Amino acid sequence: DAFSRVVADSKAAYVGGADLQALKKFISEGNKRLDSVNSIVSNASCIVSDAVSGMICENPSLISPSGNCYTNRRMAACLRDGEIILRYVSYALLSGDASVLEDRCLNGLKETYSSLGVPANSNARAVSIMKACAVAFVNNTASQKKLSTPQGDCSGLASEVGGYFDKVTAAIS
């Protein structure tokens, strides 16, 4: 409830102590799930940068004068959107649910991109690079690793986050 209000209520939700104990009874694999979310969120800036950089290095026309990332204004909007998408995917993983991702991020998004002329193939590539990043962070196989987590298998959570990225891809491609 507290997170839903936030994502109707303006101030942040601070879920610690007994409230955190309760949260972990209503999400599957609660401890692993929070490790997985943190592995993405705490690395968000590199994930977004690498995805946008890779989208562009694969198609440099995006930063030519006719490309959709031309001008600082447009580049800013694209970097921003990568971050927005990653945030909604991360919240889907925190909550164990796609409903907010679908309702607040994806429903209407392709229509907006179509009217703006934001290129769908390029956008899909940014999303797919972010997906690859997230999978590796969940499984702790990125180049930058968390040192001391108890070892175990998070392949289920990695599959789950992959499915949220796939919803994004399906919605905008």
Ligand X SMILES: *C(=C)C1=C(C)C(=O)N/C1=C\c1[nH]c(/C=C2\N=C(C[C@H]3NC(=O)C(C=C)=C3C)C(C)=C2CCC(=O)O)c(CCC(=O)O)c1C
- What is the C-alpha to C-alpha distance for residues 81 and 74, in angstroms, rounded to an integer? 10
144 is in an annotated binding site: yes
Q: Which two tokens stand for residue 142?
A: 């990125």
- What is the C-alpha to C-alpha distance for residues 74 and 160, in angstroms, rounded to an integer? 32
Q: Which two tokens stand for residue 153?
A: 């298998």
Q: Which two tokens stand for residue 163?
A: 């499915």
Least distance in angstroms from the C-beta of 26 to ligand PEB: 12
What is the per-residue DSSP string for 96-108?
T-SHHIIIIIITT
**Contacted by 19, from Cl ion, another protein, ligand PEB, none: CB < 5 to 8 Å by type:** another protein
**Is residue 163 classed exposed, middle or buried when 0-12, 13-18 and 19+ CB atoms within 10 A define those classes?**
middle
49 binds its own copies (CB under 8 A): yes
Q: Which two tokens stand for residue 148?
A: 């001391």
Nearer to another protein, 107 or 159 (CB): 107
Token pair 């692993």 in the structure block, residue: 32
Answer for which of 38, 61, 128, 169 binds ligand X (CB under 6 A) is 61
Q: Is the CB of residue 51 less than 8 Å from the CB of residue 89? A: no
Stretches 13-21, 89-97, 98-106, 145-153: which one binds ligand X (CB under 6 A)? 13-21
Nearer to ligand PEB, 66 or 148 (CB): 148
What DSSP element (H or E) covers 25? helix 18-26
Q: Is the CB of residue 55 less than 8 Å from the CB of residue 132? A: no
Within residues 45-74, the interface with ligand PEB by CB under 6 A covers 46-47, 50, 52-54, 57, 62, 68-69, 73-74
Which residues are annotated as part of the binding site?
24, 31, 35, 46, 50, 57, 68, 73-74, 78, 125, 143-144, 150-154
Q: Which residues bind ligand PEB (CB under 6 A)?
A: 20, 24, 29, 31-32, 34-36, 38, 43, 46-47, 50, 52-54, 57, 62, 68-69, 73-74, 77-78, 81-82, 84-85, 104-105, 109, 112, 116, 118-119, 122-123, 126, 128-129, 132-133, 136-144, 147-152, 154, 157
Which residues are annotated as part of the binding site for (2R,3E)-phycoerythrobilin?
24, 31, 35, 46, 50, 57, 68, 73-74, 78, 125, 143-144, 150-154
